[PDB]
Ligand binder design. Structure first.
Ligand SMILES: *[C@@H]1O[C@H](CO)[C@@H](O)[C@H](O)[C@H]1NC(C)=O
Lengths: 196, 73, 110, 50, 157, 110
């Protein structure tokens, strides 16, 4: 009799995934995302498209999925499929194809305080224009632009992750389990919040 | 010697065979650098393995120098 | 929010996404259409095909989707899914080899 | 809206089944008239024969 | 047709399509697998692939889909969506893509005896080894293997 | 089969597939994984990608899906669909451009 069922059926009962979890008016959902490059697959100079396999880590808080561990035998962490929850529609806008969304809709780790850790992997065909001038001795500045195509800034506040109180203003790359592409070498990998 | 080793599940305090009496501890954070923290490798060694720019090694000569950072020797 | 949950439950309770939003079948629903061009992806001069990335802005009123904010905590906007409400079937007549209508069921502002 | 009442009296009230041919007896035929309008001829790739 | 609605309501009250029809525990279902070739499209030898447009011709007996036509205005045969009846997972195993199942889910033909005939269609991409010794003066074998993915001899014949 | 129909109804009655198969949340699910390689489709040396046709055999126990054969006519095996029961989120980490998880349900054996 997994105590996680009692809990999940209590939470998802009286839960609408269409509804932003704003506790009240005036409340902006602080959505914290972080990118992890797994493979650089291609930069088709003809199509002018960069192909990447990334694990993007979305983090946010849903006040509706909070509970008291004492009532559930100490359970502080539950996995709920993302198809059942409200998610911020964080997408790749600078895509050439129409794949705005992620590839694998992984489960969302839900903590007792309402914290949500979603680590969905994605395969993105971005658009980055080429600078042919010095081809083939060229370096390209290819961007991945992430924004919510549903919610605005009065609703969600996109921000970068804060690990150890310092902002993660860069793409994370495992120095041991990262295979360099074969034609393209990564020199810089910054990340900044931009406003139009 | 009595070293802590990650070559078991769960972690164990096992004594090293003859030839290795240096308890080492490698650490480095991979793609899960945030949700989990740095990796933790522990065990036995005859000589302190090499170090790379991203690693964080600590080898000793005593018993149980290399506990998980969330424990004590 | 409890308010927005209650609101979205009471707005879609007796709502049929199959009927136009009109008080009488004779009247029309005016849809303000707008195209936002983002990038020109390709031009096949052989197949005579132009490939573009666009946003099809559409505005219209749904008389069945009204509410008083005073009774719902001051709410004046929500972000309903698009498969939940009536939508116009805007089709690209001069479509070549792609999709005629919209297939990305993005949320809408109400 | 009159359409809301009608589309109910047709599909739900009268228990319309969409997996049943529109025939009173299962011995009549449903005549389907189909035409075809060519909007545009995109290709005749000779290599793929399509 | 009102008799068709009534008959369908009757048949599918407690009928579950996840369940293999065995009127007695231990029985096997007999599935007849034929193939109608409509076009051999391509036999790309660079990737060892074979593309065809075929109709599978499947036939089996479901003891649950029986009725007396005298009680239903002489209805001796029904056309029923394939998703509503139990069907065996007859698939192309030797595909080169990952498309085991058929493409077009035409509706099955159910007779009052329980005889279910399904003639679905598929653009199948099968893997065949190319013998590069006498190319282009070559002859290729290029089979198409068919079986139920999940049901075995203890279950279907 | 009527026995198997009643069984499939009684198994999935109050069964939730979002919850791990464990009598107690402290226990673990032991999934015996196996890989059956069928054919090597390609080795892209440029993009460094290897296509393989594999069968990802997975075995585990769901104590919520147990029954007494004597109460169901001697049945000891059925072929439930995968989408109807809990499945482990096995993922290919070093996936380049394909699917990270399994996308073919392919009814399982119980
Ligand atoms: C959690 O539940 C227990 C009852 O098991 C109760 O005693 C305790 O006060 C609760 N904690 C909070 C923070 O409400």
């Amino acid at each position: 009799e997994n105590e996680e069922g009692r809990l999940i059926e209590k939470l998802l009962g009286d839960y609408d995934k269409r509804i932003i979890p704003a506790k009240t008016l005036d409340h902006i959902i602080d959505v914290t995302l972080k990118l992890t490059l797994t493979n650089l697959i291609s930069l088709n100079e003809k199509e002018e498209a960069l192909t990447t396999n990334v694990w993007i880590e979305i983090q946010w808080n849903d006040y509706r999925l909070s509970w008291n561990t004492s009532e559930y035998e100490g359970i502080d962490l539950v996995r709920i499929p993302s198809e059942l929850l409200w998610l911020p529609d964080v997408v790749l806008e600078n895509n050439v194809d129409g794949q705005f969304e992620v590839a694998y809709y992984a489960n969302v780790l839900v903590y007792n305080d309402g914290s949500m850790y979603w680590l969905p992997p994605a395969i993105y065909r971005s658009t980055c224009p080429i600078a042919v001038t010095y081809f083939p001795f060229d370096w390209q500045n290819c961007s991945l632009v992430f924004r919510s195509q549903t919610y605005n800034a009065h609703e969600v506040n996109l921000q970068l992750s804060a690990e150890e109180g310092e902002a993660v203003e860069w793409i994370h790359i495992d120095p041991e389990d990262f295979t360099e592409n074969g034609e393209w070498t990564i020199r810089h990998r910054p990340a900044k919040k931009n406003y139009n | 010697i009595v070293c802590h080793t990650t070559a078991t599940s769960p972690i164990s305090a096992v004594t090293c065979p003859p030839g290795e009496n240096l308890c080492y501890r490698k650490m480095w954070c991979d793609a899960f650098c945030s949700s989990r923290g740095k990796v933790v490798e522990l065990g036995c060694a005859a000589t302190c393995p090499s170090k790379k720019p991203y690693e964080e090694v600590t080898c000793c000569s005593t018993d149980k120098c290399n506990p998980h950072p969330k424990q004590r020797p | 929010s409890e308010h927005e949950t209650r609101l979205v439950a009471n707005l879609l309770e007796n709502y049929n996404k199959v009927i136009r939003p009109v008080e009488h079948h004779t009247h029309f629903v005016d849809i303000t259409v707008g195209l936002q061009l983002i990038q020109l992806i390709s031009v096949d001069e052989v197949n005579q095909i132009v490939e573009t990335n666009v946003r099809l802005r559409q505005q219209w009123i749904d008389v069945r989707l009204r509410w008083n904010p005073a009774d719902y905590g001051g709410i004046k906007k929500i972000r309903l899914p698009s498969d939940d409400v009536w939508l116009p079937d805007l089709v690209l007549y001069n479509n070549a080899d792609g999709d005629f209508a919209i297939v990305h069921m993005t949320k809408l502002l109400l | 809206n009159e359409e809301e009442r009608l589309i109910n009296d047709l599909l739900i009230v009268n228990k319309y089944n969409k997996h049943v041919r529109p025939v009173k007896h299962n011995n009549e035929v449903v005549n389907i008239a189909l035409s075809l309008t060519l909007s545009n001829l995109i290709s005749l790739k000779e290599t793929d024969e399509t | 047709s009102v008799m068709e609605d009534t008959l369908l309501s009757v048949l599918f009250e407690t009928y579950n399509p996840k369940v293999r029809p065995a009127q007695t525990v231990g029985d096997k279902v007999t599935v007849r697998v034929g193939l109608t070739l409509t076009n051999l499209l391509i036999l790309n030898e660079k990737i060892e692939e074979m593309t065809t447009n075929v109709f599978l011709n499947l036939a089996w007996t479901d003891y649950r889909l029986q009725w007396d036509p005298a009680a239903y205005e002489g209805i001796k045969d029904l056309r029923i969506p394939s998703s509503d009846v139990w069907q065996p997972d007859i698939v192309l195993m030797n595909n080169n893509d990952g498309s085991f199942e058929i493409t077009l889910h035409v509706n099955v033909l159910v007779q009052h005896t329980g005889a279910v005939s399904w003639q679905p269609s598929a653009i199948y991409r099968s893997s065949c080894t190319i013998k590069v010794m006498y190319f282009p003066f070559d002859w290729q074998n290029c089979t198409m293997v068919f079986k139920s993915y999940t049901y075995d001899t203890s279950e279907v014949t």
